[PDB]
Structure 1
Amino acid sequence: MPFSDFVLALKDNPYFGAGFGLVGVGTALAMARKGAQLGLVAFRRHYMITLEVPARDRSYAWLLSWLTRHSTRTQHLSVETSYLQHESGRISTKFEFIPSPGNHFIWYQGKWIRVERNRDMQMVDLQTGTPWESVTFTALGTDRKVFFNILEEARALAL
């Protein structure tokens, strides 16, 4: 068995040395990527504020209405048509517009808040028969009073 033969040959093989160096560089890059992901996670945890509102909760519609009332100039929008045919066939229709799925940026108080109405692409909620949706408000800072004020304003507008 050429155990020592390969060891000595590998020490003087430029190809093997280059391959080992490239493998080490790739491992270092993977470790750096993992460390960057961990650092971003820690930054989000310790210097950012988030509020997640699922579709089941009634604050979803209130927050969407508050958003469309506040940011009047929202280029991307989704429609909600209220259609009801009462007795004697009197059709009543009205178009209500809400922010479209995706990422939206709003300016409340003195902070930039990132609104993300995400519709999970997979499930169908049995209680509604519709895809699972949620809205997430993200902002920089450590004070949660802004989200509480937004929720209170949305509730007041809804009521």
Structure 2
Amino acid sequence: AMARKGAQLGLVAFRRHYMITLEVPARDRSYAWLLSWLTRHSTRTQHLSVETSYLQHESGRISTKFEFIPSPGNHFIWYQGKWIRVERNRDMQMVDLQTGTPWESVTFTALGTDRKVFFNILEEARALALQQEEGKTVMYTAVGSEWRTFGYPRRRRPLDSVVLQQGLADRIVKDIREFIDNPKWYIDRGIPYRRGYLLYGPPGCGKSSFITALAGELEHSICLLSLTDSSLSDDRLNHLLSVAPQQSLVLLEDVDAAFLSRLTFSGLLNALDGVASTEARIVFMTTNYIDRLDPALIRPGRVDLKEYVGYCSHWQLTQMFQRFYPGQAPSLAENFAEHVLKATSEISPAQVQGYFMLYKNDPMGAVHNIESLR
């Protein structure tokens, strides 16, 4: 009896003073992350099991992906200057009610008093698990007085894909970030946390595409609405503006038609000035021209600064030529831009994009056909 007591005391002292361990249950999502990380780190895992991800895509598409996990039992891993025991015990006693699997857990067992190794391993596992996912932008529509997830998540459009001016987009992005990351400044002074922006310009400037691109770069959601339609009313507009989801930039178009004339001109600004709002209420208004509008709309508590999108410039033309054609003579791009400017002065980016579509993978032909465009 004395030997057993001495052994128990020695073991408990050893564990409490010289030994470190970490446990992850099967219910926790970190279980799969740690299993995948340990599989990736150790290439020569002789004992292992397999799991397949099977997806039945439409029209009878079988998509099966094979993945490998360490087999249940004991493993030894050499990490840092330490040898760590990994115990994957699948308990043969009971089954999880939520999932329908026998109780499982994993344990990392190491010698020393340096818990930072476990923290670093866990952070690396989190990073590896997160790096596979690709960010997506979800489109939202408005029906009646309700926002709906319309369509499917959209791939985020890169910022450099859309070019507007030398630094206008940079200024807009900087102002948006400054407004977003400083809510304390607004709440301390007791001012509503809302912002409005106005983009008036010739059609074909890709204003909506630029809005989607900046929403993707900011990772914020976008909710488009066509106020020029008579289906919605002033009160419906007020409700949908107020019921907009979190971090959801709301985009509106064609202010000229409604402001000229359900249809209203001061009702929209009254609804915009309403106290009922949401966290980070950003509204963008895209239109062809500003002539039909009034300075009252461009005011604090409303559209803050006005930005105008222009036609293609020499810098814009050479930047879009470089973006389309991956690596050529810069002098060729300069000559292309000069010829385009000589031929036309009100050239829009949409026309240039269509022209480049007409001459896909044909740089020299497009250069020689500028006079054809005239």
Instruction: Tell me the TM-score normalized by structure 1.
Output: 0.80
Residue 157 of structure 1 aligns with which residue?
Answer: 128
Residue 112 of structure 1 aligns with which residue?
Answer: 83
**Could you tell me how far apart the structure 2 residues matched to 1:119 and 1:94 are?**
24
The reply to whether residue 144 of structure 1 matches residue 115 of structure 2 is yes
Deviation at 1:37, TM superposition (A): 2.3
Residue 36 of structure 2 aligns with which residue?
Answer: 65
Residue 97 of structure 1 aligns with which residue?
Answer: 68
Gaps of 5+ in 1: 1-29
Determine helix, strand or coil for the equivalent of 1:121.
strand
The reply to whether residue 33 of structure 1 matches residue 4 of structure 2 is yes
TM-align CA RMSD? 0.8
Residue 343 of structure 2 aligns with which residue?
Answer: none
Instruction: Supply the AA of the counterpart residue of 2:123.
Output: E
User: Post-superposition, which runs of at least 4 consecutive aligned residues in structure 1 deviate over 3 A?
Assistant: none
Deviation at 1:34, TM superposition (A): 2.6
Deviation at 1:33, TM superposition (A): 2.0
Deviation at 1:119, TM superposition (A): 0.8
Residue 6 of structure 1 aligns with which residue?
Answer: none
Instruction: Tell me the TM-score normalized by structure 2.
Output: 0.34
CA shift digits 1:35-88 (9 cap, x unpaired): 212211220111011000001111100000000000110100011111111110
Residue 24 of structure 2 aligns with which residue?
Answer: 53
Determine helix, strand or coil for the equivalent of 1:88.
coil
**Could you tell me how far apart the structure 2 residues matched to 1:43 and 1:112 are?**
17
**Could you tell me how far apart the structure 2 residues matched to 1:125 and 1:38 are?**
35
Instruction: Supply the AA of the counterpart residue of 2:19.
Output: M
CA shift digits 1:102-131 (9 cap, x unpaired): 011101111111111111110100011001
**Could you tell me how far apart the structure 1 residues matched to 2:66 and 2:13 are?**
42
Deviation at 1:92, TM superposition (A): 0.5
Residue 5 of structure 1 aligns with which residue?
Answer: none
Greater Rg over alpha carbons, structure: 2
**Could you tell me how far apart the structure 1 residues matched to 2:20 and 2:28 are?**
20
Deviation at 1:144, TM superposition (A): 0.1
Structure with the largest fraction of helix: 1
Count how many residue pairs are aligned between Structure 1 and Structure 2.
130
**Could you tell me how far apart the structure 2 residues matched to 1:128 and 1:31 are?**
45
Gaps of 5+ in 2: 131-374
Residue 16 of structure 1 aligns with which residue?
Answer: none
